Design a protein around this ligand. Structure first.
Ligand code: HEM
Ligand code: HEM
Lengths: 726, 726
């Protein structure tokens, strides 16, 4: 009996805010959240309570504290089969991590379409608004190992496994709408160049090193996605607050055989929000698991990540109607030209039970499509199709990875394939080949048709010679970078320039910095000059005269490319630090906490030590964390209630908490004598936008603070922060 | 797409200070550094200049930019074997990382003993002061993945492979002289408890979470190594500035058959030095590759890591003469009772060529001993013997891991083993068994003897029943934690208190924190009370009256357990930040650099942008990094020369640089008008010990600064930093 008598070891099986209860396996935290896939996993879920400890062969163990020896101080004996199994299993726990996207965090949920899309695709999962499709989604970074940090600057993966009634469909996308390269043949080159350098295996989780920017300087096709990575897109606040894209043009095929080109989007219903560079870098130190934690705790709290699936649709006859090639993955399709049509909603509503079994072993592959969908000749997509099955042979130990529970279809699967390492299914069919007579040819092929039919490829015409040649239509590199740049707000553009400037400052060979600056001058002179100035590089007269690339089909900006130009703020699921003192004004805290609760914003009560403090009226306040323990990096805003401020006014940690939150543009609210902290952050007597202050936390104080939180950060504060030593 | 004309792409193949050139593979950086192992790897080294690009089958490639497709916008063809091989190799790059110590950094070097040890051991590598043994050393953390951060709080591994003439000897040790647990059977329990928790796989590289403190609270045998982890031993400044220990008692066996008990030690000749927590944690975010980089750059600079091997030797007849069991690896042997005898010197003087091939694939195993060494019944060492060979079967793909180039013996090896995956050696022996007549029984067994003999185990007497039982002599858990505690300076004790407080504050279940504090009260009441206070816990009357454990064989302290109590500072290889302005006083810079050069201390020139600044005398100064890009975390002290101070006096990053270096107890030196920065760190016209100040930077100024650097940190400043907001 080692559990505490009071049952406080065990979290409540009900939704609870972040930090209120220990986190737990999803089926223990939320046993009543079900879907067809989660229910199909019941055959392999293993409990523990009230069971005897055994070997893997079912033999009960008596003494799991000692090896068998000759004498209690003697040598360990070879006959200890219980020690031997236990250490053998530990010795072989690890499997290779994914070659890319090794760092990732996943959850179960479900998808439903808003209406039947039968007129444009015969895909069964999109045929009926009442048809629910279980999903498993993994979000990831790209470069770093499985043990690397979350809030790096990097592209993010967004992969969705739809368990449909007509087969698994995997939509394996990223959080930007283009990729760095055009042809899959260059993927090992590009990835080698971004990953840690081969002599010393540095740096982890960073593109800020010579080989990455050497490759970018020599391959201008990369510049478009490099622009996105250098923007705040590269440092999202949360996987719930980034967009997702399939990048490639695919096809939808309807029952009549008509093909429509499609690009896939996910829209975050929580809005778009990103960190700022200093905060994201520092957060990789103070909490390298910040995104993983945030996702798990949002789900435990009921702040389920929701995303709307959208399609950009282009008729077959419009293939050649744009200035860029629809099959070129380094080009986006601006939403001003081709709007996203809303298709359905995905809700992620339960964590896994065991991260290794369900997350680490999940296998997604963009070749897993279903009837109603098809490929195009995008030469990056075409090469992906060879990679994702092949890599799973070593990563997951063989060709039966579809029998690992998380990967299993929920629909029927039967065929003549046999054997392979780790074969779970025991086939009874007398035949392992077709055509066969001895089993009357079962299982049988099925013709294509409007529903439940066999897969047939769209009969696209192919005409040309066998060539290793890039299409001339792909050889334009700067217009899309320039469209992206022009679409950003002035503060977004500053952050882009600072991203390039910081990264190129870590490039040891200066000629590479210069070469990158030369590429930037082909995109936009203002951007190039501002990066050059930060690097102590002077543009030449030739660089100053490079003519700007043309507009994209007449567009000189598209606001859907900005994170912030069109407000889409959502405060639910955000968190506020509350800096306590040893005699808090209980009326402020009542007003603060209830206003946050009403909008679904969480709070963390911080102090200079753990335990409790007692408010003015005797209310006992439990402390979640110390000021150092849960730094301002981990919250969206900071509130300091009135009370005995002299308690914390000389606490360097308390003062620094505010200076850090101030530098990183977060809303700050100060009630009563808490306004004494104004001098720490140098606020004028008459106040400033982005600082909420009043005699008490009552009246409009919390509404004003929540309004700032809806706008995410206080961009107008940017000029004032340069000066502050934080 | 080529090299710059000036040859600046290529590092000079001569020793250069950190930052002066791009880093490079060891064989290209230091081609004339050789040893028998480095030379033997020449059969597998592969160059690249002047060679054509080929498939792995030797076919020259003409276009490595494009897949083969039917027309330039058409589908990729299955017959593209060049794309297929390239992507296949990429798809299978990763192998499983090590179950523990997955994060690690390695280098080549050599060892030699100071005198023959033939009177106490017949081991050949210790027989002759002029017989040199090549080594390969990997230093590591424990918990985190291969892509986790370096400067976490954790134990460090320190593994040395000695390529001796009589076989490979691996000394697989850590940087503390004990382990957390007593019997190998519990290793998977302990490791599972410290590793990321299994539902959500959080936290990476941190013991600061519920499961680890749960296990500790329930297994008081862990407390000793936990004290070490929570002290600043847990956060070394560099792998060059920590101790190593084999932990277990082993035996030395001499030619006469006499057994002597031995514990192994490495003394770092650069002295003992650690970070402070706030700095270590922030550095995991600003540079998660800090120790990897620092090791590599020290070797490129000629600051080769050097270590003295040392033995604690205990005669066989003294086995039971201490108040702890020699075979208990949770107990250390105090150097006040048994002195460390110096044995020889190890010098690491070349980096590898390829991290994956040589570091990632290196396999170390403490069972790899040679004649003249032997085991004991330590029940932790005994079970380690089963683990290290077994794990290498899945990690390195099979039983031929000794044929991987880095693992190969440089002495002869021949036996009757055959086949296995990836078999390199082609055996010509007509026999694959013995005894055989058909090959006249070769290769033959060799009797044991004084030199070049076969291995025979020391004929230890074994008397006992077959039992799973812990020796009663092991059941004492508090006296070594207390001896360690009492042996630390007051500031080291404070840091211990702070480490426990920080960690337990991140344990969500409060009763776990309470149970840990109850364990601390069995060690030392001042320690327990100081942690309790930080946790808002009050000790009970019973807790206040727990009797302290007994002294260890009469010792009340042993200063060799402290990092800092006995000065052992060595500044060579340390680094100073020099904060530049746009008109540097060249006279200051000349004085600074000349003094640094005389003590082998490196400098990094920092500014508010990259490129160059020109000093008052026209000297062009290239800038290594910006104030934000190479924070004070990465240096040992900071110097601010005079010049146009107005240029940087209001720069927030420059001021914050000093506030962070101040908080972290680093020496700061300010010349001339740079003394105006004293205001930012709030400090006294008369000055303060630890801030060097003068009208100009001269010989006196620099001597003072270097004296401070020899003492590593300014511990007298600790009382002044709680108030600094940084
Ligand atoms: C549009 C461009 C691409 C996108 C959006 C993309 C997206 C992704 C994502 C999100 C993952 C992680 C899936 C997971 O969570 O397990 C991943 C894995 C992977 N990708 Fe891609 N990828 C792209 C291009 C490529 C290319 C060109 C190749 C090689 C030809 C490639 C090969 C791989 C491989 C080897 C994995 C590991 C897959 C596994 O172990 O299961 N990807 N990719
Ligand atoms: C005195 C206590 C121990 C010390 C000093 C120690 C030290 C180390 C070191 C330094 C490494 C990394 C070697 C390298 O750099 O590749 C390592 C790896 C490892 N150790 Fe230990 N260890 C201890 C206890 C244990 C125990 C009790 C076990 C299991 C019974 C164990 C199993 C392993 C395994 C599985 C590896 C991965 C080895 C490999 O993949 O090549 N260790 N150990």
């Amino acid at each position: 009996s080692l559990a505490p008598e009071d049952g406080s070891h065990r979290p409540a099986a009900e939704p609870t805010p972040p930090g209120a209860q220990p986190t737990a396996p999803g089926s223990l935290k939320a046993p009543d959240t079900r879907n067809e896939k989660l229910n199909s996993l019941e055959d392999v879920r293993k409990g523990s309570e009230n069971y005897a400890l055994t070997t893997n062969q079912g033999v009960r163990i008596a003494d799991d504290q000692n090896s068998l020896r000759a004498g209690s101080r003697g040598p360990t004996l070879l006959e200890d089969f219980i020690l031997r199994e236990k250490i053998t299993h530990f010795d072989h726990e690890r499997i290779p991590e994914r070659i890319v996207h090794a760092r990732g965090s996943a959850a179960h949920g479900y998808f439903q379409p808003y209406k039947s899309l039968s007129d444009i695709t015969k895909a069964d999962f999109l045929s009926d608004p009442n048809k629910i499709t279980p999903v498993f989604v993994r979000f990831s970074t790209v470069q770093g190992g499985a043990g690397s940090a979350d809030t790096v600057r990097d592209i993010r993966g967004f992969a969705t496994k739809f368990y449909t009634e007509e087969g698994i469909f995997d939509l394996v996308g990223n959080n930007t709408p283009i990729f760095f390269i055009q042809d899959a043949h260059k993927f090992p080159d590009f990835v080698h160049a971004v990953k840690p350098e081969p002599h010393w295996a540095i740096p982890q989780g960073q593109s800020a090193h010579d080989t990455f920017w050497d490759y970018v300087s020599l391959q201008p096709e990369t510049l478009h996605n490099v622009m996105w990575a250098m923007s705040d897109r590269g440092i999202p606040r949360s996987y719930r607050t980034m967009e997702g894209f399939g990048i490639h043009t695919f096809r939808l095929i309807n029952a009549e055989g008509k093909a429509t080109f499609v690009r896939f989007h996910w829209k975050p219903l929580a809005g778009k929000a990103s960190l700022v560079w200093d905060e994201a870098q520092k957060l990789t130190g103070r909490d390298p698991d910040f995104h993983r934690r945030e996702l798990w705790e949002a789900i435990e709290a009921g702040d389920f990540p929701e995303y709307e699936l959208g399609f950009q649709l282009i008729p077959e006859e419009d293939e050649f109607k744009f200035d860029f090639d629809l099959l070129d993955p380094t080009k986006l399709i601006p939403e001003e030209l081709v709007p996203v049509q809303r298709v359905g909603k995905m809700v992620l509503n339960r964590n896994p039970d065991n991260f290794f079994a369900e997350n680490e072993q999940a296998a997604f592959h963009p070749g897993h499509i279903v009837p109603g969908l098809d490929f195009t000749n995008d030469p990056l997509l075409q090469g992906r199709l060879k990679s994702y099955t092949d890599t799973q042979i070593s990563r997951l130990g063989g060709p039966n990875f579809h029998e690992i529970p998380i990967n299993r279809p929920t629909c029927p699967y039967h065929n003549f394939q046999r054997d392979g390492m780790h074969r779970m299914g025991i086939d009874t069919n007398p035949a392992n080949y077709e055509p066969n007579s001895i089993n009357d040819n079962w299982p049988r092929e099925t013709p294509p048709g409007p529903k439940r039919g066999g897969f047939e490829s769209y009969q696209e015409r192919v005409e040309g010679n066998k060539v290793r040649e890039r299409s001339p239509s792909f050889g334009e590199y700067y217009s899309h970078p320039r469209l992206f740049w022009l679409s950003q707000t002035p503060f977004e553009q500053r952050h882009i320039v600072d991203g390039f400037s910081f990264e190129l400052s870590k490039v040891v060979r200066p000629y590479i910095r210069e070469r990158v600056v030369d590429q930037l001058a082909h995109i936009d002179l203002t951007l190039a000059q501002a990066v050059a100035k930060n690097l102590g590089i002077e543009l030449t007269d030739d660089q100053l005269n490079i003519t700007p690339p043309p507009d994209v089909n007449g567009l000189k900006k598209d606001p859907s490319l900005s994170l912030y130009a069109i407000p889409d703020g959502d405060v639910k699921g955000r968190v506020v630090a509350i800096l306590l003192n040893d005699e808090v004004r209980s009326a402020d805290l009542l007003a603060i906490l209830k206003a946050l609760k009403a909008k679904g914003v969480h709070a963390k009560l911080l102090y200079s030590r753990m335990g409790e403090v007692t408010a003015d009226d005797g209310t006992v306040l439990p402390i979640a964390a110390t000021f150092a323990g849960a730094p301002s990096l981990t919250v969206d805003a900071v509130i300091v209630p009135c009370g005995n401020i002299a308690d914390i006014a000389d606490n360097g940690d308390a003062n620094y908490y505010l200076m850090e939150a101030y530098k990183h543009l977060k809303p700050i609210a100060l009630a009563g004598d808490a306004r004494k902290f104004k001098a720490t952050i140098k606020i004028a007597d008459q106040g400033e936008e982005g600082i909420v202050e009043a005699d008490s936390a009552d009246g409009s104080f919390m509404d004003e603070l929540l309004t700032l939180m809806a706008a995410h950060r206080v961009w107008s504060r940017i000029p004032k922060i340069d000066k502050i030593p934080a």
